[PDB]
């Protein structure tokens, strides 16, 4: 995952100069010092982008070079065993829902609604985690 | 300005518009091959053509073998 | 593999042989499965 | 030619004004170069046809041309670098910030209207002994000893210690050019002076665009505490009569009604004018006095009724 | 062994991957699409009464016409209740072939009434059209297994 | 020695075959069909706002809208069209093509993009719900700047409903991004090393990084809103930097969205000039180089929207925003050069995504006229910015969408869309649009700020805004070919039995069955280049496609 | 059904195998959380500008940080990251038990730091400061309950996880998804940091 981690460093390497420079050019230069807006979503940035890449190149690290990131790579090699992907299920549609209504009881200031609604989300996110680990019934 | 004059443009410009681009466009030859006349003779390649109507054992090929053509009629005409 | 086959012998009582098909319905024969068009029409 | 080419811009009025303009023109004759050329090439590639006698034979198949590329990556970055300085350069002649106003007017825009306060007047060759009041800016500290609790928390206020509801920002002055819905406000400012505005909203954002002076601000409710550089100012406006004036951001409802206009007059017009105001006079009347039609007339108080179909 | 003149690869797997130019088709038939999609429509739901595969050869069927026949109606996926009617203009020819579980379900009496019905069509000039009568008539004709 | 397959493909399907799929689909493949029909709706939904608006602006009085009613339409058709058409459909897109064009089955969370279509769904209806109230949808504009948006200015529930669907829909965008990034970065195949996957898919790795870091923030700004709104939190409140804070807050994510909606679409135009020009993409390792910088400048030009605040350091904005036309103009000198001495044959993608180089260009030289604030000072907020990010966003999610559904429908359906009607539907459209917004630049030009529900017949431009309306109606009418086309040839028009439908295809999805079986392969290609599916149907361009490479 | 057309013992099985290619549940949620770090970004910008804006006495008057139990919390939930870590180093094990343990008293902790909250919460506002009480009110309500509501849905995340161990056999797939959890619940005790020397200490 070396490439994949190298943009994120590039990433983390543009964002983290903006932020220094867009903080030194409104701390002077601005009419009220450091925008303090600006300044702070440019340092969060850089450091969404910072997490980011250092977790890639951990894994980078960790891992030996993948058929993936392997060039002259043939498709046997990483011919094998690919992991669970879920088939279809019912719950996504059902969490959404439940956060359309939390949603709409936030918007219209319904304190009924939105505990209605949390209770669905944590009803149907409940549902969509256990969908592939519940056991059959004991009777 | 003449509000009966800018409805009538809005409203029909927009048609005259799409009446020529169709006459230009939709009045093209399509790719779609021409039909086959009978006194012609027939140039395409073989056709065969089947219904997929009934359930066919397992869908898996293998398994099926060749039981047979089991041939158990006929026909015949000349137009 | 902890479970077992089912099969069931469902009494049945038309003869759905003219109106929908197990190729359109695939339980034509389990259960009122079909409405006239007609009926959808009116 | 010069007014074609400039894409409908207004010709300025103010040495402001024909500076953007010139820079508009410069940067519009840059674009439409660029713009020729890579239309002419796009034109010229599609003469690219798939030419019938083309036999079982692909393209060049080329791609990946490193010095097109870094000549086509360099010139872009001196166009830009060009429009840059000259951008930089017209941006300094934004808001000279001169300390020796001619005359200042306190532009304060409420919901769906202007208020106009002249709040001083100072010719450079000698007269206008005329100022602001500032007795009506009253704060709104909700300084009360104690709350609804029985002691301690003797809350001073919400903001800085204050209460949103403060207006203080907003200055006032003794000659208020109030518009009323059916009476566009006429601003009216000495023809050749440096005029100055200091910008103020008193509930929401908008914004102060004269299209003839080709520049426009935003009056936001608190400029000082949003760290906006509300007050700007106009070296000169060198064309006398009546110059429409429009709002330009998001006021509510009524946005569009917000029409008003900044009629430029000879500076013994504007001495009329400010003597017959401090005079009890409206601002139809002092127009009127100083022989110059009072309504504005480069637009109306168009109706206050919905629309066309709303049965009166 | 030979893939299409151009742009078709053998993959990985026996499964050809072609292409076609970006103008132009990849069924080709000479038909309008609106017909075929009449002749489709019999094939599949006209014949489900029937219940054995109804296939139509619109191609050439040479030398001994009716072995031709038996020999293409070998092809249709399971022969063994299957109903091949087989047009060749070429040689102005109808040979209709019936599997031998599609035997004595009013096939063979309707073998006669559906080359009547193709035949009265392509005289006419519709080879679509005759196919589809005769699918029509040799589904009416045919009863389910 | 013969194939026996139908006389026509089955055209629909059998009764009840469907919508248990839409409840319960896990594959990328209709989940990106269901984005791709309701994005659509939205912007039929949307584009029907503005022909109220064009109706109304046509003639100087308000013949039938108010003044709120009109003010509404542009809040919800600029809302609609960017976040409940636009940005959606990225995702659309993505879930389409994007696992086809790195060789895997699946997304990696294929769960969790079902869910982000249902959120994009539930999230765009409760804001356009905001209209069956009776105080109406949102009065405020798009941008929905922080005084008006007060519970003071704009009290009605019509606002509430925008703020909350904006920020269930933005959860769907932000899930979305974290499987197209996940799905590169860990599902690949074997071969495809991260510089050989097309360009589409890599246009769409950097904008899901543009979205998580763009939404993340709009939805702290919305509930920080919706907190001020409901509890009085003194957020926004305009004695703080309450105006400027939301500005700045929004608009760090509203120039990265203006970009999520861009870069995955100069993608789908990437992906379809080579293909159609016969020849590689020109600079493949100057477009992602392009793409990477774009959005890296991206997040740190973002206030050059709010120059005419005077309370933005004005030039460091203004040299970024310099600086970030210079990347979007390699990626325009590199198209050409892909259309460059090749055997162009103008279908009906190549038609779109030609008409997308003309109309974006015009767009975006007027964009480096609002990045000089002298100019945008007067410019600012008038209709020539309107006629600015039309000409940039119509070309570039509009004409190259359309290019893209042209492009792919084969791909998705296996059936063709007509090349007469999608003609048609092009010069309707090309025709239509610059009708609409070519006269809009003289509009703002003079004296127009936008947002204007009515104007003064003795105000100039009337004759304007009628030819605005007349070009509009164009538009509006171009639809109709492109919805028939798609009608009649989703279970009709000629099908395609071959993988390419167009020849020359590259980025290894046209290196399967044109509607691709589930898990989007039985067959993956030695993949050795950006073009697999290009080397793998022409063998023996596989040695010229390295020795004509390096001659440029 | 001789025995399984597909040779696994658990129907739910990794994403991808983690020992020679990424953990895909990591990579997702690592992303996730980044983009997490941009939301609290928005909150931390609402701050700023408020202490900016501020004239000088940046809490006002009536408020009064009681750092003395904002600090115990604040502890409390660094050892809840710690404990957590502990039940990672268990998940990558098969120690079922060992995890649930771990996770447990980790959601026991971060419950205490929840209700430590709800403590200082209830006592600034019986002294004055509430959300519409004040410009430094609202905006350190605002972020430091986001982040309670954030650390609620860890609580949630870690319950549901030890529900999810409780009904089928430890698998890489469910030692993962502990491993995402307290990727989680260790992003929320950065971001707690980050707020406690933001709010506390720089004042
Ligand atoms: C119009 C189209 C737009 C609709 C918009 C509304 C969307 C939401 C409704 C659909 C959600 C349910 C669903 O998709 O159908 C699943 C279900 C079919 O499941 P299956 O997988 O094929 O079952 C096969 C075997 O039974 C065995 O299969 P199984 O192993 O998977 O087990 C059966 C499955 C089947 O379980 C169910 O059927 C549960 C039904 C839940 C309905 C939720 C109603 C929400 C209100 C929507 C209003 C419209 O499993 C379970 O989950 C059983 C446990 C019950 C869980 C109940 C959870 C309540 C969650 C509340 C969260 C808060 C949300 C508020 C918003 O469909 C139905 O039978 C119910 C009909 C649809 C409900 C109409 C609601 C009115
Ligand atoms: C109120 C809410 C309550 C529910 C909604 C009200 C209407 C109930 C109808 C049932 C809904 C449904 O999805 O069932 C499908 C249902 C057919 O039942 P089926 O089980 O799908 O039958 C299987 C097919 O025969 C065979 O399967 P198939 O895959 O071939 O399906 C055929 C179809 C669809 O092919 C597809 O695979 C399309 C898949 C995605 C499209 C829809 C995405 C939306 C999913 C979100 C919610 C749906 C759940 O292909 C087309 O012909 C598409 C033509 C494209 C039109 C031009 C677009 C530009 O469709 C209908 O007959 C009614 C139309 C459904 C939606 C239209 C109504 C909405 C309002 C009008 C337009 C809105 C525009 C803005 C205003
Ligand atoms: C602000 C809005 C909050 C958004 C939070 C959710 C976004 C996280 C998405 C990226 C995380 C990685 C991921 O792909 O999620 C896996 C999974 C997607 O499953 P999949 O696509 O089928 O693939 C299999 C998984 O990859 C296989 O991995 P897995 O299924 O085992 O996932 C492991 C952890 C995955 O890791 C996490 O997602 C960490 C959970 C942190 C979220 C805590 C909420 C903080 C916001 C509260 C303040 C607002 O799953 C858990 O066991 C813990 C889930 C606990 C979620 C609690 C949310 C309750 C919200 C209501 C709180 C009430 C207080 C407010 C009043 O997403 C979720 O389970 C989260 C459900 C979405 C909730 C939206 C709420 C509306
Ligand atoms: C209105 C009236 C409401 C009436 C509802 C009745 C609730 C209580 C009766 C059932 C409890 C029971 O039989 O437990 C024995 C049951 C014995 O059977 P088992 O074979 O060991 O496992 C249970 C199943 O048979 C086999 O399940 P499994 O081993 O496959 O595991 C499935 C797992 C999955 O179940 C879940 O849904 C767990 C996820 C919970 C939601 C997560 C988010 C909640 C928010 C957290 C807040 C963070 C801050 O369920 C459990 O956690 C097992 C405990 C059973 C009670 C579940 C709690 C509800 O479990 C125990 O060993 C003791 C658990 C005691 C907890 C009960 C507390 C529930 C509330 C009590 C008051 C009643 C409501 C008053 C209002
Ligand atoms: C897909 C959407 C998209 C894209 C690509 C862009 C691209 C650009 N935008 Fe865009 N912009 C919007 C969508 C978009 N914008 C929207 C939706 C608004 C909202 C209006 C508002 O609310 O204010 C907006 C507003 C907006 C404003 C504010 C206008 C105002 O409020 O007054 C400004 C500058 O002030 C600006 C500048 C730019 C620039 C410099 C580019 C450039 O990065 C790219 C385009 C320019 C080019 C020049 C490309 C062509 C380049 C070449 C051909 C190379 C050679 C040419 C040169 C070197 C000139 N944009
Ligand atoms: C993707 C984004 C996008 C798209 C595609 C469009 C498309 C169009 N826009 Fe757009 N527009 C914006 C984004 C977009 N716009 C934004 C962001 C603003 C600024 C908003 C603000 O500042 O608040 C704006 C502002 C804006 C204004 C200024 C409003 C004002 O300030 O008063 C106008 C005025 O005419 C306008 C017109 C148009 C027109 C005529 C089209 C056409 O190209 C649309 C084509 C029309 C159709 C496709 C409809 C035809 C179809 C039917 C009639 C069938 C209906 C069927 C059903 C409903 C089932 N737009
Ligand atoms: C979006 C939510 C809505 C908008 C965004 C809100 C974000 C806030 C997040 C966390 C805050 C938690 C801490 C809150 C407690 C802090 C103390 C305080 O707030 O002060 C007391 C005041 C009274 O003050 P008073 O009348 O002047 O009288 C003083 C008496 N002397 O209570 C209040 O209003 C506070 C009540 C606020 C409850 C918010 C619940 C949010 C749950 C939403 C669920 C998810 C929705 C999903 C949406 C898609
Ligand atoms: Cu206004
Ligand atoms: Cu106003
Ligand atoms: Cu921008």
């Known amino acids: 995952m070396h490439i994949e981690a190298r943009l994120f460093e590039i990433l983390t390497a543009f964002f983290a100069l903006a932020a220094v420079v867009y903080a030194v050019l409104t701390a002077m230069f601005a009419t009220g010092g450091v925008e303090w807006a600006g300044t702070t979503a440019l340092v969060l940035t850089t450091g969404l982008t910072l997490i980011t890449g250092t977790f890639f190149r951990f894994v980078a690290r960790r891992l030996d070079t993948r058929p993936e990131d392997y060039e002259d790579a043939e498709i046997s090699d990483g011919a094998g065993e690919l992991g669970f992907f879920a088939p279809h299920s019912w719950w996504p549609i059902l969490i959404s829902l439940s956060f359309s209504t939390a949603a709409v009881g936030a918007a219209l200031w319904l304190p009924w609604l939105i505990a209605a609604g949390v209770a669905f989300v944590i009803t149907s996110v409940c549902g969509l985690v256990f969908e592939y680990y519940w056991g059959p019934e004991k009777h | 300005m003449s509000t009966a004059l800018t409805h009538g443009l809005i409203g029909g410009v927009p048609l005259v518009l799409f009446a020529v681009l169709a006459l230009i466009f939709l009045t093209r030859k399509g790719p779609h091959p021409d039909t086959y006349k009978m006194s012609d003779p027939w140039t395409h390649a073989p056709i065969l053509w089947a219904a997929e109507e009934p359930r066919e054992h397992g869908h898996g090929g293998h398994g099926h073998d060749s039981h047979g053509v089991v041939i158990g009629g006929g026909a015949s005409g000349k137009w | ?42 | 030619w010069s007014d074609a080419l400039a894409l409908g811009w207004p010709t300025g009025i103010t040495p402001e004004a024909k500076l953007n303009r010139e820079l508009w023109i410069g940067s519009v004759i840059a674009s439409f170069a660029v713009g020729a050329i890579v239309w002419g090439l796009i034109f010229w590639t599609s003469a690219f046809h798939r030419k019938k006698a083309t036999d079982t034979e692909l393209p060049r198949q080329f791609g990946y041309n490193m010095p097109l590329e870094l000549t086509l990556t360099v010139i872009p970055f001196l166009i830009i670098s060009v429009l840059f300085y000259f951008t930089v350069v017209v941006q300094e002649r934004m808001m000279h910030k001169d300390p020796n106003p001619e005359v200042v007017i306190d532009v304060t825009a409420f919901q769906w209207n202007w208020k106009f306060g002249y709040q001083k007047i100072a010719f450079a060759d000698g007269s206008f002994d005329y100022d602001g009041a500032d007795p009506e800016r009253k704060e709104a500290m909700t300084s009360r000893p104690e709350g609804k609790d029985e002691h301690g928390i003797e809350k001073v206020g919400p903001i800085r210690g204050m209460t949103p509801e403060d207006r203080t920002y907003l200055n006032f002055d003794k000659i208020e050019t109030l518009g009323t819905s059916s009476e566009i406000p006429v601003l009216v400012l000495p023809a050749g002076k440096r005029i100055e505005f200091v910008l103020n909203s008193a509930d929401v954002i908008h914004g102060f665009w004269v299209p003839e002076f080709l520049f426009k601000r935003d009056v936001l409710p608190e400029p000082k505490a949003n760290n906006s550089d509300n007050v700007f100012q106009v070296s000169e406006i060198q064309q006398t009569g009546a110059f429409v004036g429009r709002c330009t951001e998001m006021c509510g409802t009524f946005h569009a009604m917000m029409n008003f206009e900044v009629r430029v007059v000879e500076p013994n017009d504007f001495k009329a004018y400010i003597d017959q105001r401090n005079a009890g006079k409206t601002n139809a009347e002092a127009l009127a006095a100083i022989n110059q039609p009072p309504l504005a007339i480069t637009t109306e108080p168009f109706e206050s009724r919905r629309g066309e179909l709303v049965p009166q | 062994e030979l893939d299409l003149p151009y742009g078709s690869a053998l993959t990985s797997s026996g499964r050809i991957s072609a292409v076609t130019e970006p103008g132009e088709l990849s069924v080709h038939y000479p038909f309008p699409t609106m017909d075929l999609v009449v002749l489709d429509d019999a094939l599949k739901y006209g014949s489900r009464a029937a219940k054995a595969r109804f296939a139509v050869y619109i191609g050439p069927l040479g030398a001994d016409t009716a072995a031709t026949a038996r020999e293409i109606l070998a092809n249709v996926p399971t022969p063994e209740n299957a109903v091949l009617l087989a047009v060749s203009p070429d040689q102005r020819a109808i040979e209709v072939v019936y599997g031998a579980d599609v035997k004595g379900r009013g096939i063979e009496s309707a073998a006669p009434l559906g080359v009547s019905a193709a035949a009265a069509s392509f005289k006419e000039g519709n080879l679509i059209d005759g196919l589809i009568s005769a699918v029509r008539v040799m589904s009416a004709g045919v009863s389910p297994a | 020695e013969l194939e026996a397959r139908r006389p026509f493909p089955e055209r629909m399907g059998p009764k009840g075959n469907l919508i248990y799929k839409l409840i319960t689909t896990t594959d990328h493949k209709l989940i990106g069909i269901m984005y791709c029909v309701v994005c659509f709706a939205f912007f039929l939904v949307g584009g029907l706002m503005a022909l109220f608006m064009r109706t109304e602006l046509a003639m100087p009085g308000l013949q039938f809208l108010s003044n709120e009613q009109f003010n509404q339409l542009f809040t919800m058709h600029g809302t609609v069209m960017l976040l409940f058409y636009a940005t959606p459909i990225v995702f659309g897109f993505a879930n389409l093509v994007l696992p086809l064009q790195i060789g895997a089955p699946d997304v990696a969370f294929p769960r969790l993009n079902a869910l982000s279509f249902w959120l994009f769904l539930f999230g765009a209806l409760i804001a356009i719900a905001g209209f069956i109230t009776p105080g109406g949808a949102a009065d405020f504009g798009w941008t929905a700047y922080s005084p008006l948006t007060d519970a003071i200015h704009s009290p009605g529930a019509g606002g509430d409903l925008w703020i909350m669907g904006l920020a269930v829909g933005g959860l769907g965008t932000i899930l979305g991004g974290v499987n197209m990034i996940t799905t590169v970065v860990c599902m690949r195949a074997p071969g495809m090393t991260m510089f050989r996957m097309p360009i589409f898919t890599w246009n769409i790795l950097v904008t899901s990084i543009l979205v998580l870091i763009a939404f993340p923030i709009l939805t702290a700004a919305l509930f920080g809103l919706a907190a001020d709104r409901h509890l009085g939190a003194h957020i926004y409140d305009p004695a703080n930097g309450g105006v400027l804070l939301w500005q700045h807050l929004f608009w760090f994510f509203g120039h990265p969205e203006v970009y999520i909606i861009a870069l995955p679409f100069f993608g789908i135009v990437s992906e379809i000039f080579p293909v159609f020009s016969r020849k590689p993409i020109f600079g493949y390792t100057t477009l992602i180089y392009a793409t990477l910088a774009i959005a890296a400048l991206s997040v740190a030009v973002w206030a050059h929207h709010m120059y005419a605040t005077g309370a933005v350091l004005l030039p460091f904005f203004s040299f970024m925003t310099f600086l970030i036309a210079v990347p979007t103009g390699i990626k325009f000198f590199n198209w050409i050069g892909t259309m460059w001495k090749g055997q162009l044959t103008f279908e009906t993608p190549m038609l779109f995504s030609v008409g997308f180089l003309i109309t974006f260009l015009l767009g975006g030289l007027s964009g480096v006229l609002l990045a000089s604030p002298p100019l945008d000072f007067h410019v600012t907020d008038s209709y020539f910015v309107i006629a600015h990010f039309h000409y940039v966003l119509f070309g570039t999610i509009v004409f190259a969408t359309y290019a893209g559904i042209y492009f792919w429908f084969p791909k998705m359906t296996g059936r063709l869309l007509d090349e007469r009607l999608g003609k048609l539907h092009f010069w309707l459209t090309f025709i239509g649009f610059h009708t609409t917004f070519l006269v809009q630049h003289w509009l703002g030009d003079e004296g127009m700020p936008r947002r204007y529900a009515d104007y003064l017949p003795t105000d100039g431009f009337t004759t304007l805004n009628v030819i605005s309306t007349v070009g509009a109606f164009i538009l509006g009418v171009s639809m109709l070919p492109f919805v028939w086309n798609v009608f009649k040839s989703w279970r009709y028009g000629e099908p395609v039995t071959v993988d390419d439908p167009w020849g020359y295809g590259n980025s290894l999805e046209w290196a399967t069955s044109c509607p691709p079986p589930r898990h989007n392969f039985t067959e993956l290609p030695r993949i050795r280049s950006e073009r697999p599916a290009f080397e793998l149907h022409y063998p023996h361009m596989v040695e010229r496609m390295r020795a004509e490479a390096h001659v440029g | 059904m001789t025995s399984a057309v597909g040779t696994s013992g658990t129907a739910i099985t990794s994403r991808v195998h983690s020992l020679n290619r990424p953990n895909m549940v990591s990579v997702g949620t690592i992303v996730w959380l980044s983009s997490e770090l941009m939301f609290f970004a928005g909150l931390f910008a609402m701050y700023f500008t408020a202490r900016a804006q501020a004239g000088g006495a940046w809490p006002p008057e009536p408020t009064e940080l009681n750092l003395a139990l904002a600090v115990p919390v604040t502890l409390v939930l660094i050892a809840s990251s710690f404990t957590c870590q502990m039940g990672v180093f268990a998940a990558e094990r098969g120690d079922v038990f060992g995890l649930r343990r771990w996770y447990v008293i980790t959601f026991l902790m971060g419950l205490f730091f929840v209700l430590g909250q709800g403590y200082e919460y209830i006592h600034l506002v019986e002294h004055g400061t509430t959300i519409p009480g004040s410009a430094y009110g609202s905006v350190f309500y605002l972020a430091t309950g986001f982040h309670g509501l954030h650390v609620i849905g860890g609580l949630v995340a870690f319950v549901l996880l030890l529900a999810r161990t409780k009904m089928s056999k430890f698998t890489p797939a469910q030692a993962t998804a502990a491993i995402v959890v307290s990727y989680y619940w260790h992003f929320v005790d950065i971001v707690w940091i980050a707020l406690f020397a933001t709010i506390y200490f720089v004042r």
């Open chain 3, 1 to 42: 593999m902890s479970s077992t086959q089912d099969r069931s012998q469902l009494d049945p009582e038309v003869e759905r042989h003219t109106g929908v098909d197990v190729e359109d319905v695939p339980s034509a024969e389990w259960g009122w499965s079909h409405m006239p068009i007609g009926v959808m029409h009116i």
